[PDB]
Symmetry: D2
Subunit: 217 residues, 4 copies
Amino acid sequence: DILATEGSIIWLKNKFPTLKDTFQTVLIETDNCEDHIATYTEEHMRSLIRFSIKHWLNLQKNEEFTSVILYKNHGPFSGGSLHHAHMQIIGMKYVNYLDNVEQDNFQGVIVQKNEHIELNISDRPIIGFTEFNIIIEDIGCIDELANYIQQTVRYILTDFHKGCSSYNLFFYYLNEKIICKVVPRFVVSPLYVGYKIPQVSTKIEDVKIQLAAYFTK
Amino acid sequence: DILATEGSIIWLKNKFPTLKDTFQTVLIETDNCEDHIATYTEEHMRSLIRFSIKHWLNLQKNEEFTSVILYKNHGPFSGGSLHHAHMQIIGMKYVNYLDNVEQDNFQGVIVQKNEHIELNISDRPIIGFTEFNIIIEDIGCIDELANYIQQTVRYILTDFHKGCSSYNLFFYYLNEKIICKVVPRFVVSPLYVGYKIPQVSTKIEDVKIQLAAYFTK
Amino acid sequence: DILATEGSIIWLKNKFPTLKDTFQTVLIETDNCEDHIATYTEEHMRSLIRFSIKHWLNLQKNEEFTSVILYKNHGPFSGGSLHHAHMQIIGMKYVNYLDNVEQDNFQGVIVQKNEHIELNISDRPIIGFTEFNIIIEDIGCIDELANYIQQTVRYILTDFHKGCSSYNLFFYYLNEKIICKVVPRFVVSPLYVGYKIPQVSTKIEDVKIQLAAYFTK
Amino acid sequence: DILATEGSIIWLKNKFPTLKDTFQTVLIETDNCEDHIATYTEEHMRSLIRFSIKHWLNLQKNEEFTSVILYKNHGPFSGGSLHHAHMQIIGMKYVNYLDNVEQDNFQGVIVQKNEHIELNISDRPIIGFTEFNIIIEDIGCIDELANYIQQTVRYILTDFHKGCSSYNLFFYYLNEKIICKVVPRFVVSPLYVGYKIPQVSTKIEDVKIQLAAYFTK
Ligand code: NA
Ligand code: NA
Ligand code: NA
Ligand code: NA
Ligand SMILES: [Zn+2]
Ligand SMILES: [Zn+2]
Ligand SMILES: [Zn+2]
Ligand SMILES: [Zn+2]
């Protein structure tokens, strides 16, 4: 059942609901099974983030929900399902998604920052690994957000851990700001899990330097 | 190249070394590709842990190594490689595996405890999720350790998260004690990663109760 | 300026406000400078918690506040000011005190539990040390809460670290439950701060056993 | 009982031992009760750190100790005792002070860095608050370490939290490096302890900027 569409962007009511007291929906990003965020043109990436944010924020205005979640799963280690490039909008009747997240989960080491947008790496992440926070203070900076998401995603798929293949996008409307948390997803090394013996560098300053090389142009 | 064998238990020098200044070895647990820890007889489970611990502790006595690691990977989310049931012994020339682990990573909520052995759940885990610590104070309690590993593994594969399919074993020789940390491995739910919205119960007391039901006999 | 009184219990508008966009108040617990929670009779402890909770919850109903905080400071390491036995009620126009606290900060190792009340020790504390959570699901169990606070306070001042002298009380209205978090306050040992070398036992199970000895009667 | 002296620098065997299987000593920094690290001349600060490090590292060479700790307590919230400006050297027969500290407790956000020395703020602190790590890779850079300690201390006593009055110094000999962890000590705000409502900025990037202003000359 079609909720809204814009070209190849399609917003569907999820046919397989698994969460009680929730309105589950799926957002198809393209009519092609090859393309994703790293491949999309600047216009398609701009239109996709504008469509997603608009329908997320307008559904929250519906008094039948306490809060509405907007998020993405990509790769076999994100927790997704469909092979097609898609996002999800879940309206929740009794759950407030901000409840168990704090302000300091979105603060950190600045990679890029100006009056319009801020890109940082969490020094107090939600789960304890790498989390990239992209914050805008005005809705008019949505095209800047879309560009920062695309570059951070491109970095995760290409240079972070010499290619990571899986990630998540999480959106938040907190303190009148729109935040996108970009989270790489990977099977952690057994030597790190049991003995905190890293293979690569665990330095947040090294991630900062190599991610900053994606905003040099 | 064969290092030691005992029936179907085979200790091999790893033919694909990927870590410099380390002696990598593989320990094949059975001559069958169907059996694993949850399936093995009490005798085979006893013989496998006795063989593994003996060769781990004797290799550390070799002055060419600072420390020697004994660990296992099981399932597609552990970080392993071979489909066959195997463990690994890695001799490290300049690394001490205890360096970045602390005493409190092995303390916790007691599930089972007596003069010979202790089974607990980490209240200060190494990575931040569920970690089962099995501690013995004397080498003579090795058959008790083997039984506790098998039951904890059986619980992880059967009831924890209604079946977990993947886990890790990590062995430590700390404060003159032999510790086995049993760690379930699973792709964390996206709603938990980004919003700490759990699907199941996150209560350590609930895990304690349902794991204790495996030691009722 | 008197807001409400009940015998020696006096609710005053704080004459020294230091927080902008907040209504600061002070709650004097007794007309004596010798008595405190550990000394008070069962009736005075019951009347003090009933008065405090009632005025805290009724002030939150005032549309001029986003949230209202109810808390106590005791001893020279709590962050208090007056030597007299007092509590504080702070009405906040734009701050929601639940924002940066999560559900798991109130879960833990059960010390005492029944259908009416639950006493636990945080396995995921807010700050990282010992935190005692006393939870009631119905307002009618307020006299049970008052008794559990008094015993937990008595334990902190007497046996925890062989006498702790300082603590905090924090009240929360979360998921239709009334929670009191009892937090001991002490200058942490320098050997622990810099090297995690403890003087006493850091085991949550040992605190559980010795606190349970205060509910044996 | 005098162990070593250099002008007003006096190394004494602690007359009040309270730790069994340890050799406790006290290091008096000056013959005056007014002076401390922030006041000392560049020469006295250089001579004090050279004397302290030399006697710390030489005592560890004594086979009667597993490890030797070098640390300082300053102010009423550090955990010290004497009002006089002093440090402590504790030889421990069976304890290795590195056991429960990891490599990542000394990594972080770089404030100052060159080939000789590195000053950072912990992104993974030992206790969870602000920790300043000063690392040198060669013993010849000891006068640079002494200057960085003095400036970081001066900042803590003057601008951090508009004056902090208390701090700790912790020294470590790890991975053939000499590390000094400078830790401010203060009574945490009750609104932060119970509700993570900060009074000041909790941003590591703000501390980085204002501490960097002490190395502008
Ligand atoms: Na909350
Ligand atoms: Na260590
Ligand atoms: Na929140
Ligand atoms: Na260790
Ligand atoms: Zn803009
Ligand atoms: Zn035994
Ligand atoms: Zn009741
Ligand atoms: Zn130098």
